[PDB]
């Protein structure tokens with residue numbers, strides 16, 4: 001019903017005279033709200049380093065903030081512990097529940113007013129369990145409140161000259177069996193980079209960790225790129241060198 | 256050092272005037288020793304039906320015996336129970352330890368003299384744990400004692416006009432996670448027959464059961480037969496219809 005300018009103006013009216021903390025991740029959503037908050041209010045983009053994202057990813061987030069003149073701080077957290085390594089069922093809840101607690105801490109030592117996150121309108125019709133953990137503590141989702149779409153976000157990002165980066169997705173999601181270890185996520189990430197580089201899988205690729213078995217996930221059109229037996233033999237041999245017991249391919253290719 | 260005729264004659268000298276029970280399975284090894292025992296001695300080929308081999312396999316064994324005039328009896332056993340469904344580490348030991356006990360029972364109610372099995376010379380340089388369980392109780396392996404090779408067995412089978420059947424291998428081996436259930440082995444067997452029929456995988460094929468995940472094992476030359484995405488989509492969809500949670504392909508193809 002409302003258009004983008006009305007939404008954009010509504011967004012600026014909200015940030016007026018507010019001390020804003022953005023849960024900044026480097027993604028398109030969070031960066032867009034971080035930039036709009038920086039230009040109209042006293043804003044701090046806080047990145048909580050869980051150990052679930054690669055160094056490249058955190059550096060990318062830090063640089064984007066320095067590029068767009070977003071005031072940004074990163075907090076490396078010792079999050080991986082024995083209670084957290086187990087309980088894989090609620091990892092996302094615990095993950096975001098902890099991040100929320102650190103943001104709330106930064107907010108009250110800084111004595112800022114609100115904390116916002118880049119949750120968009122589309123995200124509300126999903127099973128996002130960490131939005132349970134986040135929207136458990138007071139956490140404002142302004143893009144979601146103003147009915148911003150994925151296109152509304154991408155579109156306003158172009159006008160504001162924010163480059164659309166390629167999405168880096170949580171490494172702990174590759175871990176299908178407890179515990180979420182630093183080494184297990186490494187085992188997948190190396191496997192993913194090796195496959196992606198030697199066989200050029202630009203589209204969706206995943207190497208799941210299931211009890212030291214690597215499960216390769218790929219897209220329907222990328223498929224032929226690994227169908228010859230010399231490519232398969234190289235992947236199985238290299239992924240086992242990384243220490244997977246068996247290397248397998250999930251035959252449910254993404255449509 | 257010794258030739259086949261000397262071995263063959265040595266074999267006939269051993270069975271002379273002996274009441275022989277053969278642990279008959281229908282395989283090339285067991286059938287050959289069953290036939291030579293039948294023609295020179297009062298012999299009974301006993302098949303112990305574990306629930307680990309398909310009906311086709313037992314029928315094939317029964318028919319081969321009736322075809323070669325081998326006196327044969329089959330004993331269906333209630334072997335699958337709660338202690339036996341678990342303890343997958345020693346399945347083979349328990350498997351053969353039980354079969355041995357039934358053969359020993361048949362032997363002493365019949366008051367026969369010896370029990371023999373088709374263990375060949377080549378088999379002695381393998382980790383065969385049920386030969387531990389078998390050669391735990393007195394169990395004579397005459398082909399092994401007389402240095403019979405795989406070729407010595409195949410060769411003498413041709414002279415004696417015993418057809419070489421295609422080997423049917425234990426279904427419980429497809430089960431990689433406790434428990435070895437009747438339904439789980441079914442889940443693999445159906446999967447195997449479906450893949451083997453619709454895509455013509457004549458060479459080595461396996462569908463392992465690992466916590467309701469099907470792991471497809473195939474040979475290097477058969478590989479291209481399932482490499483197109485319409486073949487993969489059909490297999491993943493059908494094997495999940497059988498009730499596997501995920502359908503995966505082991506990228507360690509047999510050389």
Ligand SMILES: Nc1ncnc2c1ncn2[C@@H]1O[C@H](COP(=O)(O)O)[C@@H](O)[C@H]1O
Pocket residue numbers: 023024025046047048049050053096099117130134169170
């Ligand atoms: N480095 C980070 N700093 C702050 N929040 C993060 C970070 N990485 C991931 N998140 C959180 O991850 C959630 C959504 O991203 P994801 O669930 O990882 O795709 C949001 O609630 C973010 O707060």
Ligand SMILES: Nc1ncnc2c1ncn2[C@@H]1O[C@H](COP(=O)(O)O)[C@@H](O)[C@H]1O
Pocket residue numbers: 278279280301302303304305308351354372385389424425
């Ligand atoms: N139906 C059967 N009757 C008697 N022994 C069997 C039967 N099926 C399998 N075996 C045993 O299986 C062992 C070797 O075959 P396998 O280990 O199944 O490849 C031998 O010790 C046989 O006694």
Ligand code: SF4
Pocket residue numbers: 052091092093095096130170171172173
């Ligand atoms: S995917 Fe889950 S574990 Fe990873 S950052 Fe998001 S909520 Fe945390």
Ligand code: SF4
Pocket residue numbers: 307346347348350351385425426427428
């Ligand atoms: S493979 Fe193992 S379980 Fe199957 S028949 Fe042989 S010893 Fe028994």
Ligand SMILES: [Cl-]
Pocket residue numbers: 108109110111
């Ligand atoms: Cl304060």
Ligand SMILES: [Cl-]
Pocket residue numbers: 092127128129130131
């Ligand atoms: Cl979530």
Ligand SMILES: [Cl-]
Pocket residue numbers: 363364365366
């Ligand atoms: Cl008696």
Ligand SMILES: [Cl-]
Pocket residue numbers: 347382383384385386
């Ligand atoms: Cl064995």
